[PDB]
Amino acid sequence: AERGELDLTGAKQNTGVWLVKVPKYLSQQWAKASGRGEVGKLRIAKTQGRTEVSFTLNEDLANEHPFVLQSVGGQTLTVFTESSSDKLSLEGIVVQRAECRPAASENYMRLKRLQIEESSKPVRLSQQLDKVVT
Amino acid sequence: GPSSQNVTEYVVRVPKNTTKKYNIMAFNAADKVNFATWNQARLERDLSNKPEDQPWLLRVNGKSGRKFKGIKKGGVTENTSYYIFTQCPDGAFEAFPVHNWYNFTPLARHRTLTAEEAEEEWERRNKVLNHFSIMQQR
Amino acid sequence: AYISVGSQPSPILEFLEEWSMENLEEISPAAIADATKIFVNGCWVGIHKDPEQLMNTLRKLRRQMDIIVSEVSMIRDIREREIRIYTDAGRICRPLLIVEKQKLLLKKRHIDQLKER
Amino acid sequence: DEITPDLWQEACWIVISSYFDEKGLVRQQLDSFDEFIQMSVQRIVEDAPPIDLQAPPRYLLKFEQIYLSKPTHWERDGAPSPMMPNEARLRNLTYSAPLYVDITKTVIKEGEEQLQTQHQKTFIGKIPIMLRSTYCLLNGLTDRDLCELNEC
Amino acid sequence: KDILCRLEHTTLRKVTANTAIYYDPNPQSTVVAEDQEWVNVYYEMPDFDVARISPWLLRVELDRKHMTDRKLTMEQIAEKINAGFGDDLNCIFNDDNAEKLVLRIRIMNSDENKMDDDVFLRCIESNMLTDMTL
Amino acid sequence: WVSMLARGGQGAKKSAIGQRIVATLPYIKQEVPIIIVFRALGFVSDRDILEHIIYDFEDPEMMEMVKPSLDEAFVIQEQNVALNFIGSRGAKPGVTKEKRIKYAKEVLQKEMLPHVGVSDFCETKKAYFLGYMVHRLLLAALGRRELDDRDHYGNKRLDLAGPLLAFLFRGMFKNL
Amino acid sequence: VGIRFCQECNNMLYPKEDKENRILLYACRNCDYQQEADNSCIYVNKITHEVDELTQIIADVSQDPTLPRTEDHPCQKCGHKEAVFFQSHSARAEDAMRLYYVCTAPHCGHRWTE
Ligand SMILES: [Zn+2]
Ligand SMILES: [Zn+2]
């Protein structure tokens, strides 16, 4: 028991968690909701020899997100948290990796075009003066 | 059976703020880490610079166990986000953003040639003989 | 011949991250062998496991002028498993007619429209 | 529909004609200069670290935005006037545009009081202007207008 | 053509298929059955090496085509290696009838009876391939 | 520059090991062995360094190419020792070890591969790129990849008025 | 021929013999770790190095538009008629004019030499 000691109860419990990368719009919508209590529902469909994972955006939030799994054998990922009370703890070990991709093919690029425009909004460039400053 | 056509649906929850920040700890697959042997673990900030803008230092089972040094990920996820899903009895998935990404690399615990002593071995630039015997003297 | 004036690789990097490109800081070195390295302006940004789809998507974007400007070079070295993207100035380029399925995408309607330039 | 070989020769030179109707022949020169004025000059000024003075009062200077006016010539009496390229050739002048920058000056006097003043459009020098570039006087002038200025 | 061969420089590298170094603790069961067929014959009534022998073995495979082109003989190569290194090394070679030409090389028995015993054999391997003249 | 020494040198030790790879970093008088640079970046174990240079350990031909380089830097087995070694050759002599290590980190942080990164967290990015340079050198030495052509205009850039003028303006504005 | 790293400090393992047991061992320099050797071959040097180029070929080359395609060499595995052929163009061979074929059928990266 010490300040620098790390709690390993989560690891001893063999806790399994999933690591998922999500786009900005999905995260931005969740940030916009400010954590009202729900942002969507994750649906998992398993067949005789295949597994399908997808996420559905909340209808209220909007006013499909198929999930692609990735092999975890390439790395050992574990989640550790730093509590505000200065008590580090190990949440668990990542057991699956997934990635979120959009459903729209071409119309999505229109959103990106605006996003690139938004990103380039504060990019200042030289201005032309009709008259010489006096 | 049901598994051949099993369908599962769970809710997603995004709490506004959490008392404890979430980070990512990564180890090389070839490192062959074993959490079972992790009887004790100590995570403290490194003292090489001499706080939040410095690398981490991980020590397992004190000096006896393997020592790892953590380094914050240089890349910035300005256009990307990382979340962790944790199973809960209620069955509604919870997503927690990762504050930072850290990569931990093991540190060797053995007599290492000192910088002053390495100068002496530099005279034997390529005339070194029986590389094994070098550490025997040390 | 035209000499590229250059543009920021930020829109290309952001799209690559959004696309299924694994960052270089997050992967393990063992995964690099099978995947193809992605270079943007000479900086190794990451790796991709589906180079053929990525190149088709990149080519489609540049032709539609969506995220990739016209003067951006997308080179896939199939043998070397590398995709090099260039956005800087000083690159010499020339306009070429695109061919798909042994057919010019340039049709009579384009010529007729140009005739009344 | 599809360009038959009997019409390709006309079709291909219609394409080449439209390219030169738009690009011209010195596009690489003009586009490169336009990028330098529009983007590079602003980026260089922005990328410059703020100047911090401390020797007590602390002064900070930040160069915000760049302005460029038309190529101007000043008579010996001090009256500015637009500089036509032909006048520059005849009178051996340099075809240059005045360069102005917005500078913000914030001073900290250790009294927990911060005074911020902006010097809008501070003259910092003259940039030679490439002819017929976006910042040249001849830019956007019809062929008739160019002749009135004794320009080919 | 006889004069041509007598002039054109030929080093062991030219007519060598590959070189491998094995620990080879027991000379009898040297590496694999292929060497077992003919290695025993030399070891049934061996001479000048019954006293001792170095553990490390340097096995050399010689290309048949290259050897035939220059009309080189295994006995001559062994004599040439013996002449260059004297008794420092022991050379054992198979008969020309075998489809594969092999030449086992070891270090003097007296030394076995300071740098290293495996690195030194590596130095000889490079030394024989390039410097040694056949 | 990442260079592989020629085999012209004759020696029992030099010939046996093979050709070693050295790196010519900016602001350093003398060539620095490549494995030292990786150590200075924060990669000490040979497995870690080789993972950034060789992406497929199943290939034995490439592994043997880097072995002579590993032996050259076997003396240096710590990041701080490697940093001191690079600092010893720095642009200005280091009065004390602490200055040498700080100077060496300064060069690697910003003066070495600046396009890869110029921050303090870019060591991993530079290790991968530096390993790619070593990997590219190995392919050329192994004959698996053709040597680059200086006359190729893919490998060329034309500096026009803009980039030319911008280069001048950066110096003048700094003077201003 | 193989390369090993000690499980302790993940440094290069170099061969070594023990006189007491007369058995090949792999020992780490900076670690003192030792391991039983199973290959028994310290290293093999291939002067000819007739490495099968088929291994070096990448099945993705079938997607190259600049490579020639022939329908006269059907794939031996899937029987697809179209195949792409090319030369090694690999240095250190000292001679290379033979063609290497790669099946153009997707998901069948079969490669062969006629
Ligand atoms: Zn070790
Ligand atoms: Zn096939």
Domains and CATH numbers, chain E: 1-134 (3.30.1360.140)
Of residues B28, B30, B79, nearest to C18 (C-beta): B79
Of residues C15, C30, C31, nearest to A112 (C-beta): C15
Q: CA A118, A121, A123: angle at the middle one, nearest 5? A: 135
In the block, tokens 């997808």 appear at: A54
In the block, tokens 């160069």 appear at: D63
β-strands E57-62, E101-107: how paired? antiparallel
- CA separation (Å) from D69 to D43, D50, D142? 18, 25, 21
E strands along chain F, which residues?
2-4, 21-23, 32-33
Rounded CA-CA distance C102/D2 in Å is 12
| D26 in contact with F, Cβ within 8 Å | no
Rounded CA-CA distance B71/F127 in Å is 14
Q: CA F11, F17, F18: angle at the middle one, nearest 5? A: 85
The token pair that represents G96 in the structure block: 């290379």
Find residues 18-57 of chain G whose CB sits inside 8 Å of chain B. Answer: 27, 29-32
| G94 contacts: CB under 8 Å, gap ≥ 6 | none
Whether residue D32 contacts residue F162, with contact meaning beta carbons closer than 8 Å, is answered with: yes
* F10 Cα to the center of ligand 2, angstroms: 50
E strands along chain D, which residues?
51-54, 58-69, 72-74, 80-82, 96-108, 114-128
Residue G57 sits in the same domain as residue G81: yes
Rounded CA-CA distance G102/G109 in Å is 6
The token pair that represents D63 in the structure block: 């160069």
* G107 Cα to the center of ligand 2, angstroms: 8
| Burial (Cβ within 10 Å: 0-12, 13-18, ≥19) of residue G69 | middle
The SS3 of residue E82 is helix
Rounded CA-CA distance B13/A40 in Å is 8
* C to F CB pairs, distance under 8 Å: 45
β-strands E18-22, G41-45: how paired? antiparallel
DSSP string, C89-103: TT-EE-----EETTE
- Please name the amino acid found at residue F124: T
Q: What domain range includes position G30?
A: 1-45
Rounded CA-CA distance F169/F162 in Å is 10
**In Å, how far is E64's CA from the nearest CA of chain G?**
12
What is the residue extent of each domain of chain B? 1-138
Query: Could you tell me how many helices (H) and strands (E) chain A has, helices first?
Result: 4, 7
The token pair that represents G101 in the structure block: 């074929």
In the block, tokens 């969507």 appear at: A40
The token pair that represents F164 in the structure block: 């030319």
| Burial (Cβ within 10 Å: 0-12, 13-18, ≥19) of residue F50 | buried
Element (H, E) at D23: helix D5-23
**In Å, how far is B41's CA from the nearest CA of chain G?**
19
Tell which phi-psi region holds residue B28, choosing left (phi > 0), alpha (psi between -120 and 50) or beta: beta
- For helices F79-88 and F34-41, give the axis angle rounded to 10 degrees: 120
Element (H, E) at F97: helix F97-106
Residue B53: φ, ψ to 5° = -105, 35
Interchain pair F16, E130: CB under 8 A: no
Rounded CA-CA distance G2/A89 in Å is 41
- For helices B115-123 and F79-88, give the axis angle rounded to 10 degrees: 60
**Chain CA centroid to CA E86, Å:** 13
Burial A22-56 (b: 16+ CB within 10 A, else e): bbbbbbebbeebeeeeebbbbbeebeeeeeebbbe
Whether residue F81 contacts residue F32, with contact meaning beta carbons closer than 8 Å, is answered with: no
| A125 in contact with D, Cβ within 8 Å | yes
Burial F89-107 (b: 16+ CB within 10 A, else e): bbeeebeebeebbebbbeb
Q: After which residues is chain B broken (C to N over 2.5 A)?
A: 50
β-strands B7-13, B93-107: how paired? parallel
**In Å, how far is C56's CA from the nearest CA of chain B?**
22
Rounded CA-CA distance G34/C38 in Å is 40
- Number of structural domains (chain G) is 2
Rounded CA-CA distance F92/F28 in Å is 9
Residue G109 sits in the same domain as residue G58: yes
Q: Which of E99, E100, E82, E19 is nearest to E91 (CA)?
A: E82
Q: What size, in residues, is chain F?
A: 176
Query: What single-letter DSSP state applies at residue A5?
Result: B
- CA separation (Å) from E124 to E66, E104, E117, G42? 22, 13, 11, 15
| B68 in contact with F, Cβ within 8 Å | no
Q: Which of C105, C101, C93 is nearest to C63 (CA)?
A: C105
Task: Indicate which technique resolved this structure.
Answer: cryo-EM
Resolution given for this structure, in angstroms: 2.5
Chains touching B (at least 3 CB pairs under 8 A) are A, C, E, F, G
Rounded CA-CA distance D15/C111 in Å is 7
What is the residue extent of each domain of chain F? 1-157
Q: How far apart are the first and last CA of chain E?
A: 17
Q: Is the dihedral of CA C112, D1, D6, D8 positive or negative?
A: positive
Residue G30 sits in the same domain as residue G84: no
Residue G64 sits in the same domain as residue G84: yes
Rounded CA-CA distance C66/G8 in Å is 52
Interchain pair C64, A109: CB under 8 A: yes
The 3-state DSSP composition of chain A as helix, strand, coil percent (nearest 5) reads 25, 40, 35
- CA separation (Å) from A44 to A67, A68, D13? 9, 11, 58
Is G41 one of the annotated binding-site residues?
A: no
Cβ neighbours around G56 below 10 Å, total: 14
Q: Which of B131, E39, C35, E46 is nearest to G27 (CA)?
A: B131
In the block, tokens 């530099």 appear at: B122
β-strands A16-22, C73-77: how paired? unpaired
Whether residue F126 contacts residue F41, with contact meaning beta carbons closer than 8 Å, is answered with: yes
Q: Which of F6, F162, B28 is nearest to C29 (CA)?
A: B28
| Burial (Cβ within 10 Å: 0-12, 13-18, ≥19) of residue G71 | exposed
Q: Which of B98, B99, B96, B100 is nearest to B15 (CA)?
A: B96
For the domain made up of F1-157, the CATH class stated in words is alpha beta
Rounded CA-CA distance A30/A23 in Å is 11
Rounded CA-CA distance F131/F38 in Å is 9
Q: Which of E72, E124, E64, E129 is nearest to E100 (CA)?
A: E64
Residue G60 sits in the same domain as residue G34: no
Q: What size, in residues, is chain B?
A: 138
Q: How far apart are the first and last CA of chain F?
A: 35
Residue C6: φ, ψ to 5° = 100, 155
| C18 contacts: CB under 8 Å, gap ≥ 6 | A23, A112, B79, B80
The token pair that represents F96 in the structure block: 């004390």
Q: Which of D38, D51, D55 is nearest to D139 (CA)?
A: D38
Rounded CA-CA distance G53/G51 in Å is 6
- CA separation (Å) from C57 to B68, C51, G48? 41, 10, 44
* Interface probe with B: pick from A42, A86, A93, most Cβ of B within 10 Å: A42
Is G75 one of the annotated binding-site residues?
A: yes
Whether residue A115 contacts residue A99, with contact meaning beta carbons closer than 8 Å, is answered with: no
| B111 contacts: CB under 8 Å, gap ≥ 6 | B135, B138
| Burial (Cβ within 10 Å: 0-12, 13-18, ≥19) of residue E112 | middle
Task: Looking at chain B, list the stretches that DSSP marks H as alpha helix, in order from N- to C-terminal side.
Answer: 115-123, 131-137
Cβ neighbours around C69 below 10 Å, total: 17
* C76 Cα to the center of ligand 2, angstroms: 23
Q: Which residues is B86 bridged to in the sheet?
A: A17, B94
